[PDB]
């Protein structure tokens, strides 16, 4: 299983839509749970990559509401409604339906 990602760093300003796309070689959905296994991580420079959302739709406690994850069988999306200086990081989509965990290629966001 290979984990692709979106195009390279986006030259987006503050307070606008930010879209990151993730695509999978296989299907990471269901398993009699219908819960589409996919994690999203943001990584600040010099800080460990803290998780954003888990199973691509469950927003974590310690993250803002602006991070919205849209999921499907193969395609996945992170959308940011109003990006600011606290959201600059590099983003990874990780599959964990199958045992060889492959992270995403990294999607840096640029102000």
């Amino acid at each position: 299983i290979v984990m692709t990602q979106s195009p390279d760093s986006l030259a987006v300003s503050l307070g606008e839509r930010a879209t990151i796309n993730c695509k999978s070689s296989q299907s990471v959905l269901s398993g009699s749970i219908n819960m589409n296994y996919l994690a999203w991580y943001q990584q600040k420079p010099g800080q460990p990559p803290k998780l954003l959302i888990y199973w691509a739709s469950t927003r974590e406690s310690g993250v803002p509401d602006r991070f919205t994850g849209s999921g499907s069988g193969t395609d996945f999306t992170l959308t940011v409604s109003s990006l600011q200086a606290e959201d600059v990081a590099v983003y990874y989509c990780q599959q964990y339906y199958s045992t060889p965990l492959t992270f995403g290629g990294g999607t840096k966001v640029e102000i």
């Binding site: 219908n34 819960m35 469950t58 406690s61």
Partner: protein, 314 residues
Amino acid sequence: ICLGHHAVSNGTKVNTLTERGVEVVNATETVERTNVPRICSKGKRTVDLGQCGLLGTITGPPQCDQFLEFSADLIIERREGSDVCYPGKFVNEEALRQILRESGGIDKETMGFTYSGIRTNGATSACRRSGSSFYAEMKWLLSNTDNAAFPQMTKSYKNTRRDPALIVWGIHHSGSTTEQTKLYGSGSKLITVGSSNYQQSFVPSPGARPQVNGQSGRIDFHWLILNPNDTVTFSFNGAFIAPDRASFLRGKSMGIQSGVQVDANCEGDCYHSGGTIISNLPFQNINSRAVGKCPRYVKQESLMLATGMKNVPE
């Protein structure tokens, strides 16, 4: 000329206001008797709980490992499905079951309940995977190492989400007072649970019980619903089963309690213990407890709606 109508040798006997059992040239079914003995529900998300119980997905016995934070528009319960590994019972059980059946699956969001001065890795021989263990999201809060005073602890969790959280916890009534002192220490333990709409409190009551699942003590599994921007406070002196992850609703589902295997071969609408009632007919005589948008129950075995005329043989 001679003017007349049509008739057949073998028609159908139908019920009528004036006479009962009148002979008609053709008639149609009204009450649906044909039952599909399968939960065929294609086009809808479906989880088959199996050996797992609906409440167990909230609390996490070993049989409910697979469906701990599921998400589906059709929740299927089984009679073999058990809700607990360690023996116990949920208070206000059917209210929680009906909340779970209309949840669209559940999510688990961590409480951040750090604990100092106590041992939190509860271990029971009944709730077994690789040794003496406990539930998925429950910490059985024991003493430090042996008989010792459990410190009075106040832990507050604030539901910062925009949806009402489903808070759950447990109360351990030991098999004896000596066992209660072994696990939590001496003294009369008293636990209060405070919220804006929840003020119920209680005292654990050690005592001898029949050996259910190889254990004597029982866990009363209490629960509440937290509104958005609301905090719950657990003030426990001892004998507590603290939650780890608060449960959160997802959306709208429709939960069934069936006993047949699941497939995806029908655009089914309502389901019951006997299977699925696929029909456009207005009435059915299969099960009185079918839930969903489908034909409705009647007492008559079979109703004949007259489609043709009053035929008379030639």
